[PDB]
Amino acid sequence: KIEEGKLVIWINGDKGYNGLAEVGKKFEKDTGIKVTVEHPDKLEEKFPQVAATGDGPDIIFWAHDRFGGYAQSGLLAEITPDKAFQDKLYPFTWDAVRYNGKLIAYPIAVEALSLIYNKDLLPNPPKTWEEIPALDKELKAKGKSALMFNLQEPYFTWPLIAADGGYAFKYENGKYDIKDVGVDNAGAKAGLTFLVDLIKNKHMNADTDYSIAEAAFNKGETAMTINGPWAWSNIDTSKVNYGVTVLPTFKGQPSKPFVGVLSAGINAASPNKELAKEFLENYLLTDEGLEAVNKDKPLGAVALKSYEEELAKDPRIAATMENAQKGEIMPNIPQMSAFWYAVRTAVINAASGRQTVDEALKDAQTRITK
């Protein structure tokens, strides 16, 4: 069902889909071509189903990590932007959208975790992970804790584990080596061990989940937290006086948060590929375009250098980018579902003495490169 002479875009419901529409209206003015933005529930699952049979939308919006699965099944058309369009986005962001050495989507927005702190309790954030244990005792003397984050999820603990050497899969060129996993090196042990210590010296609680670390920061009980752009909305509400800054270093090495890139890909089945290419590169990927979606619902840090510079006037955004420029692009290969599951295990076991650091990581690694 190659609709033809139309544009149909699929975007998640929690995004700036009305702003996106106005861009669509703009397009419709210089072209006569109708745009249509929809936000169907479970679009990330419906896409692969409808597209396998030459259906779905012309363009799909989703975080880049799902795009590798789509591309393996040849659901996404390859893109060919020119060097001069390429130089308009941050370099790092193009590597988020290369599958099998091919460009499969356009990078929109960039997300990464940041260190969020209570300005009131902690007038100056720690620049070191090593210096947090002291801060905790220092702060516990007044009834408050130093830090509180999601420990139940690998996404949240990786920044530290990867700080000194850890990685998921090696990127030596534009391909990921699926047998070269960095969960069992020196660096990962150094970082996981540091984390275990925090739990063992009662500086941290082993069952602290997302909702527990949020409640705590937000009620003013703890002085720091580790969260993303999606979380800001609730703190505003909470009325806390927070700041957002770079992640602490570990052994003098930066924390390595995973990076997620919001991306737009074109259905391999679209008859409208040149139309979509036109709309993306010249209508959406411009200052007036990112601004129109953004006014509807913030995007965070964007990949468009020009607009980034203006957005980065909000220290929360500049910090997100700073963190993403130090982070680890979340690999988009199918093997990643192997890393999650196994890393969630290695960490939980280490944090509850159910297995040492050296035991957990080693069995994690065999599981992954299995």
Ligand X SMILES: OC[C@H]1O[C@@H]2O[C@H]3[C@H](O)[C@@H](O)[C@@H](O[C@H]4[C@H](O)[C@@H](O)[C@@H](O[C@H]5[C@H](O)[C@@H](O)[C@@H](O[C@H]6[C@H](O)[C@@H](O)[C@@H](O[C@H]7[C@H](O)[C@@H](O)[C@@H](O[C@H]8[C@H](O)[C@@H](O)[C@@H](O[C@H]1[C@H](O)[C@H]2O)O[C@@H]8CO)O[C@@H]7CO)O[C@@H]6CO)O[C@@H]5CO)O[C@@H]4CO)O[C@@H]3CO
Check binding of 171 to ligand X (CB under 6 A).
Answer: no
Residues that bind ligand X (rule: CB under 6 A) add up to a total of: 13
155 counts as binding ligand X under rule CB under 6 A: yes
Q: Out of 340, 356, 362, 363, point to the residue binding ligand X (CB under 6 A).
A: 340
Decide: is 184 part of the binding site for ligand X (CB under 6 A): no
- Does residue 363 bind ligand X (CB under 6 A)? no
Interface map 8-27 toward ligand X (x if CB under 6 A): ------x-------------
Out of 10, 23, 56, 65, point to the residue binding ligand X (CB under 6 A). Answer: 65
What minimum distance in Å lies between the beta carbon of 207 and ligand X?
16
By C-beta, is 129 or 158 nearer to ligand X?
158
Query: Taking CB under 6 A as the criterion, which residues in 291-330 touch ligand X?
Result: none
Q: Which of 19, 57, 125, 154 binds ligand X (CB under 6 A)?
A: 154
Residue 46 touches ligand X, criterion: CB under 6 A: no
- 111-130 positions binding ligand X, by CB under 6 A: 111
3-state secondary structure the chain: CCCCCECCEECCCCCCHHHHHHHHHHHHHHHCCECCEECCCCHHHHHHHHHHCCCCCCEEEEEHHHHHHHHHCCCECCCCCCHHHHCCECHHHHCCCEECCEECCEEEEEECCEEEEECCCCCCCCCECCCHHHHHHHHHCCCCECCCCCCCCHHHHHHHHHHCCCECCEECCCCEECCCCECCCHHHHHHHHHHHHHHHCCCCCCCCCHHHHHHHHHHCCECEEEECHHHHHHHHHHCCCEEEECCCEECCECCCCEEEEEEEEEECCCCCHHHHHHHHHHHHCCHHHHHHHHCCCCCCEECEHHHHHHHCCCHHHHHHHHHHCCCEECCCCCCHHHHHHHHHHHHHHHCCCCCCHHHHHHHHHHHHCC
Binding-site string for ligand X from residue 229 to residue 248, where x marks contact by CB under 6 A and - marks none: -x------------------
Q: For residue 335, state whether it binds ligand X (rule: CB under 6 A).
A: no
Residues in contact with ligand X by CB under 6 A are: 14, 63, 65, 111, 153-155, 210, 228, 230, 260, 337, 340
